[PDB]
Amino acid sequence: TERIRNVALRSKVCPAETASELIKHGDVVGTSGFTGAGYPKEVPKALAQRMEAAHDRGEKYQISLITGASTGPQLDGELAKANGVYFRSPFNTDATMRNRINAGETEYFDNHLGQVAGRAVQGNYGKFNIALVEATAITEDGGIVPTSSVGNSQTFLNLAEKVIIEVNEWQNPMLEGIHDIWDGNVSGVPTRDIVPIVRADQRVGGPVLRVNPDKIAAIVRTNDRDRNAPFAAPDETAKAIAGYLLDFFGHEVKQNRLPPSLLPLQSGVGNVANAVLEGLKEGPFENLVGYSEVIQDGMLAMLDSGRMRIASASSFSLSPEAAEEINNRMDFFRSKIILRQQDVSNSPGIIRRLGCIAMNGMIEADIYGNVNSTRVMGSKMMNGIGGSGDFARSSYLSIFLSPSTAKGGKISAIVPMAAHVDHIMQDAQIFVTEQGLADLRGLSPVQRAREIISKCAHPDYRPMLQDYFDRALKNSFGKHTPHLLTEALSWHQRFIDTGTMLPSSLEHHHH
Amino acid sequence: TERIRNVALRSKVCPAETASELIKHGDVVGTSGFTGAGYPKEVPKALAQRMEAAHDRGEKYQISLITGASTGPQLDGELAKANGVYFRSPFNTDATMRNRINAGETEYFDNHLGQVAGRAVQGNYGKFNIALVEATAITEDGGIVPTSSVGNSQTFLNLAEKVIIEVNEWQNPMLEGIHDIWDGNVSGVPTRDIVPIVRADQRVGGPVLRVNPDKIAAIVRTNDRDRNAPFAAPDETAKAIAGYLLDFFGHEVKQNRLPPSLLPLQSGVGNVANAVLEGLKEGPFENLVGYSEVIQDGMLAMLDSGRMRIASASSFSLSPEAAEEINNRMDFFRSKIILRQQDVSNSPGIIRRLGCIAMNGMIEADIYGNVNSTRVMGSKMMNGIGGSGDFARSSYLSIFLSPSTAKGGKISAIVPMAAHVDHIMQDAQIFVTEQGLADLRGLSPVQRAREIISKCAHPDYRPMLQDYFDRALKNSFGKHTPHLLTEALSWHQRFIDTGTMLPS
Ligand SMILES: [Cl-]
Ligand SMILES: [Cl-]
Ligand SMILES: [Cl-]
Ligand SMILES: [Cl-]
């Protein structure tokens, strides 16, 4: 079937290589793409090539690359390989791009995902030269049907001087109808509109991105796959974490602090999220609802069994197996899923109104329960804050989940002081590791520290943590949040110098 | 003219001492009180005295004290002296209470002010045994008219098992009409209601707090004063700061990034605010609107000079001169001011929708523009995060303002690394000191550093910050946000060891 159903736009179809020539050195480029789904593929590959060729001849060729969130090898990967990106925002998971960022070759700022559209409209990223957006289809009246994510595509389409569309025949035609795109003022000039979402299954818009066809400078016909990350099978650490979390939910229900259907759930991806979604599928709950950033394997399974009734997200993040399953049953799952603009999926007004339960990963937390989601040793970027801030602060309950150690035991995920902070104490109420669960509601910092050390810290590190804390309590400038500034960051430096946070017994250590 | 206009409730009047006896060791007490305005006074004093006596006889006698925000000597002060508060939330400015907190004798957690009502309903502080609320009057229908703040009072009245009302004759009877108390589910069980505020001057509720009269166990007639802000004027440092900000706003308007009337303004608690407001009072921006937590002296003046049209807040924080001024002209000012529940004034959904400009003070910022609002040397509580987070993260523009130094030049307000973080990089776009303004929008952390160091840092400290940053760029573990962890916190330790951040 013909995917470009607007006859007039067919005249703008052309090869990827030619379309990529529309993108000039210094251009700010907004693209589709969120958790490895729905990013443009062929134009970025052709761009990277021409970039490398330019560079080889001593000619500068770099762009500013603003996305929904993370993309995949064909975009972030190819462009970072070509060294073709001078500035990147707001979220990346590609390893080559991460190396450019951590070497200072690509300037990076990881804005809260729900705020990116707003800040783009305010002009923070400068003037948008190009919007580059992947589509399932173009409708009879020139509407752009998105693919496996919505992200910021509508905002980029509004702002950009020129538009390039990739129509990807790999994406299932029955994605059409799954998106909800609102024409209301979510991220524009104040006063903004009330986003009137009062239930997770509510649609407020329509199925297409809107763009003036006169801005469309090229359409490229493509056929290439998203980045479908291998399924991260839960290990015993992930299963233990999930166990403690599910025990906690069951307890809150039995104490009437949560309904039996819990509240709208936001979860991440990976090992632990997968263990939690598997536990929810088997637990004593019913009629669950997702209001998250992403749809993952475990959510599909609950939508299939009827355990989950609806899942709202901005994107899919599926394994190949799960992708195949939803592709063969898009008719059924399309009725269970709403994909929203990320400035709506990550809207704090909505997250709070709905009372979402936030469940997020972390690099580390300190004994007072300040959380680092991004910067290893305080200076090396992992991925970015993403929407963890959007959700942690706005949620009914903010839960952080992590192995108690990293790097094969050589790093403790509970430290004296976090080397960088993404989520302040006030934005984190519950911590879960494979060692147990700390409930910090209503506690002072010293009381948080007693719970976090006793419930969450690994036994190999707990005596060092207790020693730091005990001595801080005796010696800190103030006793409200006790610290020893002489050693607060010394475990990290110890790791930098020696590859482990564990002390050597050839020198003294108070514990 | 009788303040208690419900005849039947007059039979509940009793002595402050007798009322205090309703409050038992271990109780959770929610009170009125926000920025030194509208907190109960007599029952706390009577309680404090009974607490000391009990301690002497060997009887434990402490409470949990949950407020709107800060109170004053009659409440926080007296209970601190008596050592009668085991836990305190969310915001304190009383010196005696601060000393209990920093000595570890009172447990404190400074929640975001807009979230306190919600967490209290959730059960985070435990069950509320008592709500102790100051009132201007009690209407014929049994409505409780608030005094100089709303705070969390509606929520505490809802939650508490027993209610004590102090009716304070000192408070102006013409406060009645000024408050807007919403019927809706703002902070209750999800799903919450949409709060239909789309304009800062929009009233959506009524003038009184609602409470079941069967829950009222005692009404205490009182007569005692709120705290006042000092009467003290902006010095050359604050005026320099206001000058840079006002120039910034001017450039924004000229570039069409702000309207000529700007956007609703949130002005933080502090003295740099006064400079800023005093600057706006005679600035080129007309038809201004406040959507804030508090009505300061500055705001009152603009409401007077017509330069500001309306101000929404949860509370008053006025000098005695300004207090006298508004109490002479309440009929004028009452039409210009709306006092709301703090979970409405500080609602992130509302703040974002209105597109507030947030202007807040700070202890320090690091060179990457993380902000500390609360904890000196990372461990010693000043006041609390208050509503600075609610507004910083939700605002259209998040501005932080500060002298570039503290303690007569012996502390730099710009440091290699903040000893504690309240506001992350993502929540701070603009910094202003008396040295200049740093516009960080669209910038990576190293780019932020270059702006903050060059524009904001004091000349005494700027070469030292540049030295730290340059060696970090060379030697840091990663280069995205360069640090030398062996010296990131060394300026703070140097201050602890020697009394100054300047090397010998
Ligand atoms: Cl809204
Ligand atoms: Cl809490
Ligand atoms: Cl709302
Ligand atoms: Cl920005």
Residue numbers in the entry:
A (entry chain A): 2 to 512
B (entry chain B): 2 to 505
Quote from the publication.
Acetobacter aceti strain 1023 and other acetic acid bacteria use succinyl-CoA:acetate CoA-transferase (AarC) in a variant citric acid cycle that is required for a robust acetic acid resistance (aar) phenotype. Strong selection for key roles in acetic acid resistance and central metabolism appear to have optimized the structural and functional properties of AarC, making it an excellent representative of the class I CoA-transferase superfamily. Class I acyl-CoA:carboxylate CoA-transferases produce reactive acylglutamyl anhydride intermediates that acylate CoA, forming either an acyl-CoA product and a free enzyme or a protein glutamyl-CoA thioester and a carboxylate product. A closed active site enables AarC to engage, immobilize, and desolvate acyl-CoA substrates and to stabilize covalent adducts of Glu294.
The AcCoA ketone analog 1a, in which the thioester sulfur atom is replaced by a methylene group, was tested for its ability to form a hemiacetal analog of the tetrahedral hemithioacetal intermediate stabilized by the external oxyanion hole. Compound 1a was unexpectedly degraded by microbial contamination, yielding a crystal containing an acetylglutamyl anhydride adduct and a CoA analog (modeled as 2a). Despite our expectations, electron density for Glu294A was most consistent with a mixture composed of both free carboxylate and acetylglutamyl anhydride adduct in a 0.4/0.6 ratio, with a relatively narrow range of B-factors. Since density associated with the 3′-phosphate was ambiguous and weak, the large ligand in subunit A was modeled as 2b. The electron density associated with the large ligand in subunit B did not extend beyond carbon atom C3P, so it was modeled as 3′-phosphoadenosine 5′-(O-(N-methyl-R-pantothenamide))pyrophosphate. An active site acetate ligand was also included in subunit B. Subunit A (5e5hA) adopted an open conformation distinctly different from a partially closed conformation observed for an AcCoA-derived acetylglutamyl anhydride (PDB entry 4eu6A). Subunit B (5e5hB) adopted a partially closed conformation similar to that observed for the glutamyl-CoA thioester adduct bound to acetate (PDB entry 4eu6B), even though 1a and truncated derivatives (e.g., 2a and 4a) cannot form thioesters. A more likely explanation for the difference is the absence of an acetylglutamyl anhydride from the AarC•2a crystals; crystals obtained from AarC+1a adopt an intermediate conformation characteristic of other covalent adducts (lower right quadrant) that may protect the labile anhydride. Degradation of an AcCoA analog by unidentified microbial enzymes produced an activated acetyl donor and acetate, which suggests that ester analogs of AcCoA (e.g., 5a) could be used to produce a stabilized acetylglutamyl anhydride on AarC.
